[PDB]
Design a protein around this nucleic acid. Structure first.
Lengths: 150, 52, 171, 139, 149, 126
RNA sequence: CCCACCCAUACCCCGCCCUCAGGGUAGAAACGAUGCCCUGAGGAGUAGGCGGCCGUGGAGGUCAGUGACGAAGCCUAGGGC
RNA sequence: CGGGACCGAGGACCGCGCUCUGCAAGGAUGCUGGCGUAAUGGUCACCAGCGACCCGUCUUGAAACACGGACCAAGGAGUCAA
RNA sequence: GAGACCGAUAGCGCACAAGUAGAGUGAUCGAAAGAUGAAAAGCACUUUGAAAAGAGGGUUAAAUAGCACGUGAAAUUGUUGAAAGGGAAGCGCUUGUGACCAGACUUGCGCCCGGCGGAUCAUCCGGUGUUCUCACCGGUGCACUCCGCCGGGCUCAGGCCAG
């Protein structure tokens, strides 16, 4: 016998989505290829967020995007791996290029009416395969009723 | 008898599923994979004249 | 009807059977085992001697706490009895088989009991009254009997082995 | 668009009507499946370019998908019957599988399937009589 | 085993019976081995013991994995920043206790030896000076290494 | 035809795993059940007792589900089922299902002979 | 006090099973990528926790499935996984 | 420099090398004999050597005590709603 | 009128002369119990028995369906065959004996000759289809070219146990 006071630890993170969405499976295959064959850390972070559950992908609003588009970020491509929602408190939407997992109808309409562009993540993979000149944004994780109750 | 027999489904998800099934009906490999004999069908989706 | 001894053909044999017979299954089993394999006339004479208490049926399996007699010495046992009712039923079946053989045209004096078998019939359910207002079973254990009478009646060797045998055959 | 070979494979990889699943392997009844095995490489009904070989009365009959007629099932198949020398059949089948980039990964399986069908079309030989063995069977 | 000897054996990487390691002698190591003397036998190994141990039972720790030392390329890829590019360089560093002894010794996976051909002394779990096998036997450890390796 | 070349077939254990005390009780089937009593000697693995099944008895992955001829059994119900083994006559052998009639068995056996496919139960219903 | 010898599921070497870990695999001649290839370590278990599989009655779909040339059930010192 | 035992994983080539026409260098080949069938192999019954308490429950720390079990078939216990 | 319900120990206590038979002074309590066969064709006639029945002989597609009746499990029993047994058996590992078995194998591929039987040899022309350079079809071969068959010879690969 061998004395092993320490214990080998199995992985405590997701390695695959629990979702059965076929298009998400295709996206996961594409970003597995990109994070294996490139050196860009952007692709690895994107792959990990594609694995995540919905409470780990809180929505990002247009006012949050407009806040982060200030101070030299007006030309960077915004990348969100969750839903982008509309904020009707934001009366003037700036021009922006946003790639998201999905958009709400009003958010897509307001971005296109302001003159920006909405992209899917596979179009993002085509145009920026190394994540150059991008702004990777997350929504508020702890802004949940249960997390308040913790 | 007060077992829950019926299932409430969102109308939006019902409409989503119906649209997905309609889109799948226009894919000829999926018709064969579901087991329909469509090898002699001239076109998928098959549209017949309303005069007939 | 199918007999248990299916190997015996009915061309030169004679069979008899009796069912639901209200006679003791254990006594009948011992009597049938006593006459198993015998000549027909010897079996008939022995069963009449059993009725007359001149010859005894040895009690081998169903014999617990029975009596002892000098007539068991012909069988090499001490426990032997005289089951008169079983002997009567077996005489009736043996005479029926004799009549069947005579109708078939066989030689009666050369026949042996090739097969004889006693099985348990469905039990007769009487009741008896016991003390303290109790009722107990008082059952009969009847039997099925059947009997059939019949007429009394260097490859793949090795090369070395082959060579040795050829040399021994030559010399 | 919304439909591709990858999408159809993700839809039908776990169940379809051609699937034959048993303990010792998963097989496919698909006509455009050489080797009759359930995989993306051999799923001819899934793939945009695909080949399939069936026996004819004499020789083989090879079907190939036409990429411009995917929505027209009655005119989606390019069919050639080879009833000639086996070497000529192998040459033409390998040519339509590899010379123009139409599934060059399938040319070994296609030539093998044509060879198997042509071999099965030969007359069968009579089997030797069964030798009785032992004591109960022999006597 | 009490927790302090258990901890010292863990820090010496002696987790299984008949595991062997190399230790550079300082006071900070000598006191540790003195404490775990009811479980170990140690001594001063000669050049033949060092070379036969490294040649027959030499394994390197490469990315946490136990790799047999069958080529000089493994040694150069894992120790070449210290100038140890071959198995003779590894043996020299261990034997002469060179300036990179710590890296060479820790790169070597702990040696897994057999039971000795010929057995131990009749009462194994006494000290060497009392007729047993435990403790410091100095240059006599080479006969034990020859029996176990 | 002869099977594809393979490593020798090794069975780590050929004896079945018999249920404890099923030799003494007729109401207990011999099929394996793990003893769950806290003081059970088979569960505690005292020597001289019945062995318990474990993953260490697993067969070689290269030879799992191989019959001694080297083929893998594939159950077939008709001629179209046996025709699925056209490309696998060196790896798979056809076993006709028990409820197939004698005439259909004759058809399956003839087709499998043409395809060069071994039939495991080709002499039944003859 | 000395020499040899005996054997544990312990130690060493080799094979095989599983689990965990770390790598490889698309201008696809390309794959049950839920796959395959390479390498290393580890293996007792009550209460307790988690995963995967097997089996039974019934429902939708599917196998152009089996069946009076014999379905289901039952018996079997007959075999295979 | 002899004598003996057990083992042969892998499956085109690629590497490190050497004593360099080639090799013992990233895992067994070559030569030969008998047999080609119950001979090898397997199942069942039995003998032989060694091994081996009767299960479940309960209790405490544990045993012991105690309780249930003549035998077989079918039935038989974490469900549904809010 | 229906059911992702139950299928004769289930489902109402009751699928049957069931709120019956039966019990209790009484209020009340309250079962068990379905299936031959398509059709009775439900065994003529002979024979043995006092009879029940048995045996022949019949009916039937089948009596291995005989008003004990579809199928016919287990406990438990009888006969026949094999075996073991000096105060328990049963079980694990490993041989042996006896009995009984499943596989594997039976030859294939490739060359070199000889003999047959045919021209779906190569090239070219026309048409058609395709992946647009690959094919198929019709004519052309006139037998040193192709395709099968039959005799030999040779190489290789082949089953079990071994040196």
């Amino acid at each position: 016998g061998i004395d092993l006071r320490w214990k080998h630890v199995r992985s405590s993170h997701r390695k695959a989505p629990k979702s059965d969405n076929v298009y998400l499976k295709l996206l996961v295959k594409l970003y597995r290829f990109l994070a294996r064959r490139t050196e860009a850390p952007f692709n690895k972070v994107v792959l990990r967020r594609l694995f995540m559950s919905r409470i780990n992908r809180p929505p990002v609003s247009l006012s949050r995007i407009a806040r982060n588009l200030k101070n030299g970020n007006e030309k960077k491509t915004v990348v969100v791996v969750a839903t982008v929602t509309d904020d009707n408190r934001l009366l003037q939407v700036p021009k922006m290029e946003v790639a998201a997992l999905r958009f709400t109808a009003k958010a897509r309409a307001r971005i296109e009416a302001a003159g920006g562009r909405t992209l899917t993540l596979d179009q993002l993979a085509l145009e920026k395969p190394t994540g150059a000149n991008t702004l990777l944004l997350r929504g508020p994780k702890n802004a949940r009723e249960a997390v308040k109750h913790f | 008898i007060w077992r829950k027999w019926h299932v409430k489904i969102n109308q939006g998800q019902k409409r989503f599923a119906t649209a997905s099934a309609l889109a799948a009906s226009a894919v000829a490999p999926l018709l064969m994979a579901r087991g329909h004999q469509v090898s002699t069908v001239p076109e998928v989706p098959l549209v017949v004249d309303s005069a007939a | 009807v199918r007999y248990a001894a299916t190997e015996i053909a009915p061309t030169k044999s004679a069979r008899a059977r009796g069912s639901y017979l209200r006679v003791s299954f254990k006594n009948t089993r011992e009597t049938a085992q006593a006459i198993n394999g015998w000549k027909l006339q010897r079996a008939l004479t022995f069963l009449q001697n059993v009725i007359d208490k001149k010859e005894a049926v040895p009690m081998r399996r169903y014999a617990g706490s029975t009596g002892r007699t000098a007539q068991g010495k012909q069988w090499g046992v001490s426990r032997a009895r005289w089951p008169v009712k079983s002997a009567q039923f077996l005489i009736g079946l043996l005479k029926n088989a004799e009549a069947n053989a005579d109708a078939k045209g066989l030689d009666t004096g050369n026949l042996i009991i090739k097969h004889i078998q006693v099985n348990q019939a469905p039990k007769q359910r009487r009741r008896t009254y016991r003390a303290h207002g109790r009722i107990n079973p008082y059952m009969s254990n009847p039997c099925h009997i059947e009997l059939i009478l019949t007429e009394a009646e260097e490859s793949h060797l090795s090369s070395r082995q082959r060579g040795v045998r050829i040399r021994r055959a030559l010399t | 668009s919304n439909v591709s070979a990858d999408l159809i494979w993700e839809v039908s990889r776990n169940y379809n009507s051609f699937l034959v699943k048993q303990r010792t392997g998963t097989f496919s009844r698909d006509a455009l499946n050489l080797t009759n095995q359930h995989s993306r490489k051999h799923a001819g009904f899934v793939n945009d370019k695909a080949l399939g070989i069936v026996p004819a009365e004499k020789g083989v009959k090879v079907i190939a998908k036409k990429v411009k007629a995917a929505n027209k099932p009655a005119s989606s198949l390019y069919t050639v019957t080879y009833k000639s020398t086996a070497r000529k059949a192998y040459k033409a089948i390998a040519s339509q599988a590899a010379k123009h980039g139409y599934r060059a990964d399938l040319r070994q399986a296609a030539v093998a399937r044509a060879s198997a069908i042509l071999r099965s079309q030969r007359p069968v030989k009579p089997e030797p009589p069964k030798k009785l063995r032992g004591a109960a069977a022999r006597r | 085993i009490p927790p302090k000897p258990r901890k010292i054996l863990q820090l010496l990487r002696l987790r299984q019976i008949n595991n062997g390691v190399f230790v550079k002698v300082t006071k900070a190591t000598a006191e540790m081995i003195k404490i775990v003397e009811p479980w170990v036998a140690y001594g001063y190994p000669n050049l033949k013991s060092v070379r036969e141990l490294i040649y027959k039972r030499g394994y390197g720790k490469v990315n946490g994995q136990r790799i047999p030392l069958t080529d000089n390329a493994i040694i150069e890829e894992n120790l070449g920043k210290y100038g140890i590019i071959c198995i003779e360089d590894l043996i020299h560093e261990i034997f002469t206790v060179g300036p990179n002894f710590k890296q060479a010794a820790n790169f070597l996976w702990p040696f897994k030896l057999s039971n000795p051909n010929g057995g131990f002394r009749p009462r194994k779990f006494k000290h060497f000076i009392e007729g047993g096998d435990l403790g410091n036997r100095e240059e006599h450890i080479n006969a034990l290494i020859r029996a176990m390796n | 035809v002869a099977a594809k070349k393979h490593v020798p077939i090794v069975k780590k254990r050929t004896k079945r795993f018999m249920r404890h005390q099923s030799d003494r009780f007729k109401c207990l089937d011999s099929a394996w059940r793990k003893p769950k009593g806290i003081d059970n000697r088979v569960r505690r693995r005292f020597k001289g007792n019945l062995a318990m099944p474990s993953i260490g008895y697993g067969s070689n992955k290269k030879t799992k589900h191989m019959m001694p001829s080297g083929h893998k059994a594939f159950l077939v119900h008709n001629v179209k089922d046996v025709e699925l083994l056209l490309m696998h006559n060196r790896t798979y052998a056809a076993e006709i299902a028990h409820n197939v009639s004698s005439r259909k068995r004759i058809d399956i056996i003839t087709r499998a002979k043409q395809l060069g496919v071994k039939v495991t139960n080709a002499k039944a219903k003859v």
